[PDB]
Amino acid sequence: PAVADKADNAFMMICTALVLFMTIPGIALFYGGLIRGKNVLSMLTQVTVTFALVCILWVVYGYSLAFGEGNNFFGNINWLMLKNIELTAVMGSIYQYIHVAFQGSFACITVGLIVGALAERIRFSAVLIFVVVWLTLSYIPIAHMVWGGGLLASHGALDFAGGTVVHINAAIAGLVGAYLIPHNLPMVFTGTAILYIGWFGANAGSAGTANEIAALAFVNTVVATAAAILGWIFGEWALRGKPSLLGACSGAIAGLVGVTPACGYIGVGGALIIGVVAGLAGLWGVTMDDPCDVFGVHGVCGIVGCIMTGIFAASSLGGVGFAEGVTMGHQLLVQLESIAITIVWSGVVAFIGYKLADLTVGLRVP
Amino acid sequence: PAVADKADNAFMMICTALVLFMTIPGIALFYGGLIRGKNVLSMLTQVTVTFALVCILWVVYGYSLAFGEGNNFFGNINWLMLKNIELTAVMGSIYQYIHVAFQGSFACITVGLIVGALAERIRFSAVLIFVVVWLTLSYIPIAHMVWGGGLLASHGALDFAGGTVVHINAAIAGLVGAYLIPHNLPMVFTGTAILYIGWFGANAGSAGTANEIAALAFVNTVVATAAAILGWIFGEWALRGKPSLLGACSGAIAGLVGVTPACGYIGVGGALIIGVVAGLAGLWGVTMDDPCDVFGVHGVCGIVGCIMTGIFAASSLGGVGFAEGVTMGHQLLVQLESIAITIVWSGVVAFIGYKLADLTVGLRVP
Amino acid sequence: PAVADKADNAFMMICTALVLFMTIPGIALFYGGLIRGKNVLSMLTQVTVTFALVCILWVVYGYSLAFGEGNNFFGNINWLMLKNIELTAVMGSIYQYIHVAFQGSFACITVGLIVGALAERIRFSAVLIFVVVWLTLSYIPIAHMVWGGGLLASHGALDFAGGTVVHINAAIAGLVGAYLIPHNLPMVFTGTAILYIGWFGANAGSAGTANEIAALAFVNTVVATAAAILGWIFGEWALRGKPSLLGACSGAIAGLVGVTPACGYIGVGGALIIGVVAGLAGLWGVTMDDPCDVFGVHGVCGIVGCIMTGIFAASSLGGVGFAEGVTMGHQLLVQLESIAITIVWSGVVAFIGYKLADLTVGLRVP
């Protein structure tokens, strides 16, 4: 007799709006000020159209396969166009319709992160094909594997808000793209800004409820982002003699990414230590072919966050505590496996997607 | 013994903020990148000052006449400055003060849509006069007629979030203006963006509560907007050989508008079919004197949405179901009447307003 | 047996996001379009890094000293890194973690207002030192004095959302800075916009709950801002023959500031009268060395708001009513004292901070 709680309903609809704010115009504007000015309009168009396409595919089969009961790798196809979901169906403590909208907005932003990164160098029709393939055969199974009670979840993987599902997944997809293939810094910062605010929806929302864990995630997000900014900036001041706007904006992102899988499981001590290590590591990454340094931050910091969750979730270290019977040893192993599975899964799919495009319309923008 | 529900309180205050975000800076920035660059500052000023004036008129007599008990066409004047509204007065399941703020923000955005459209070509003092007339004698009675238990509502008109009260109403007011009387596309998209996010406040908020219907409206908004984008874009690719940023931004708006009256009454199937037809129809409109194509999208798509609600609310078609004793036949008729009443009411008033200005200070900007 | 209410949890986390939106990118962008274009990137960087530093200092000792039990002037140091705060600890009707995040975001925005004002003319390392000093020895004690059950609160001072803690405090700190020491108007308005929307989080959020008082504050915010815009604009039309965008944006701020201490205690009548007097007074201020007219609006309107709360909170005048045994006479006196204590406290500290910087790294940007 599952009963929807209006307080949770309220929180999760607003959180869905926030995550939606991340893509439209968040990620669009972030990339907008980074890419060559002659490429901006084509990019914003591509993000917008691919946003739309993702919203639709999610409704048709996206949600059903991501989040329906199935196997360890995917759901099913009987929630097609959300059929058999009663309007009053409750998932967790919120109406299911709001879970669809929430989970959909994650799908959008992830796609937004790859589209914007590669909009400069890929044909319009070729990114569409890619999106369709990689949403379907990478993001959806991994979503299901991590948040849909599939393989990774069934083996105790900690990923509170999408270090694998979003960050690693997309960073590897981006890297594959570049392998096969700033002009407005106020615009970049504005994007970073919208991304940051939008990100409280993503991290607190992942609690599914306005509780003490939503509260922990929110606090940890503020903390680790700030730690990452200062860590990056300090590093930049040491390496380059001075902080920069792009470094500060990059810092914030590095720690937002690092804290993503962790925010709901760690103490503020942990959030701070993670923000610092994520900020430095992100700086290290972009100091070491990667489009708009998407792996250099998302990939590198995605890995750092996911590994460091396997440590800082420990009650000893201020976390919520590992599950019963789980050692920090074993949990670390499982994160490594989650990470490695994501990297390979996305990579292989990315390769299939781009190649499908490359053999139907061509990658190379005319 | 009506009791205010804090969850609803929370939702409706945040939703009010979102709708407020639509005008300030949403609609301002949308028009900002469309109009000639030499006109932008005068426009943003005019939207801001007229926003303020609308916030005030709403408090003085706006809310009382829109939403007080009266006749079929207007309320009364005993909630002047919100007197006789106890601070703890409850409307629906939220405190009345939050209903005032919500309904006020609709009033603002509607006005924002006309002001911004005509800011280029109308004298400052002449728009003020217009606003005062047309808020008072068009938006307020129609508000009351549709959402204040007046004429249109009493006859079963479906308009969940303002296809008539907002979109048709303002589009006709805009058309009258032009009859008598892009430079920054990143800015236009940013505006579209803020408008989109802000619009979840308008559509879900219209539920008055964080329930399964707020959930339906939110989902339908995401769906139909996305459908509209792809529909517009595809049409544009057929007509023009390629999608454009303005087309994509226009697409989103077309479907946001189309779904506005429908979002709380239809299934996602319906949202998708409405988004598509609204996107194509919007494109058709702007292909066929209309200031910033305000009728071409708001008018045309306003009509499409309102008519199509009379169809897709049917349980057969996945909707919430028509009221008892109501056939799809009869419901369609009533939408047509709602539409026709709005078009004529706003038109006649618009004509009175502009002429009053034109005979006191003059329309024609010096 | 204090029990956290999920509805309040939801409201206060979203309100925290809104206040966070005020700084990042709100205040950054406001100043962005005001300062010389050659200074903008250095400014946005400085706001971002000092934001981060404030988020961290708040977590380490900021919250503990601001909001722990202590004396009349400061709390304590046993909530260092939020230790001894159980994750499920409840303050008011929300989890304590959300109070930390809320109160932290006030700390950020206040700092944002001084940093942005003086970013043009102060050395990076010198502002850092300043921030550390003045957050610690001004903002924290005043926070504690006004909202932490300290001196000013214990004597019945009304300041619902920070006329002293935020506005006067920062305006005086800014004035001290200038004493010792527009290019993008669309950007300025966008900032004003984000500031306005963000401000509903600050004013309603200060209720701690989604109740009738959150509802009153929200309504009053809309009202007084609008009143202030028209008051400023009308004054500007009289003084200068015409309204300007900067005047309108300045108007909105003047009334937002004026209503800040008052919003939770006054009637809408009062909100309107306060908005008007705040708008005119703000205009008067900037007509009478003050960096980006920060005192001319925040200082002047901060004082006006705080004094005028001591009047309009009266039930006679439509307010919530003064406390038992409190006359309007006595309440006015106490506001004057709150005001005077803030002005001197911040001033003295500001002087210490800047001088510490000036004698370690130097003020004067190289």
Ligand SMILES: CCCCCCCCCCCC[N+](C)(C)[O-]
């Ligand atoms: C918990 C949800 C996670 C949301 C993911 C969105 C990533 C936004 C960051 C974009 C920055 C892109 N860049 C250049 C650093 O790679």
Ligand SMILES: CCCCCCCCCCCC[N+](C)(C)[O-]
């Ligand atoms: C449910 C609330 C409806 C809100 C109405 C606001 C309309 C925003 C769209 C502006 C687009 C203007 N334009 C040029 C397409 O006409």
Ligand SMILES: CCCCCCCCCCCC[N+](C)(C)[O-]
């Ligand atoms: C209730 C919270 C108060 C938030 C304080 C933030 C102040 C924002 C206004 C910035 C305007 C700066 N200026 C130039 C007018 O001084």
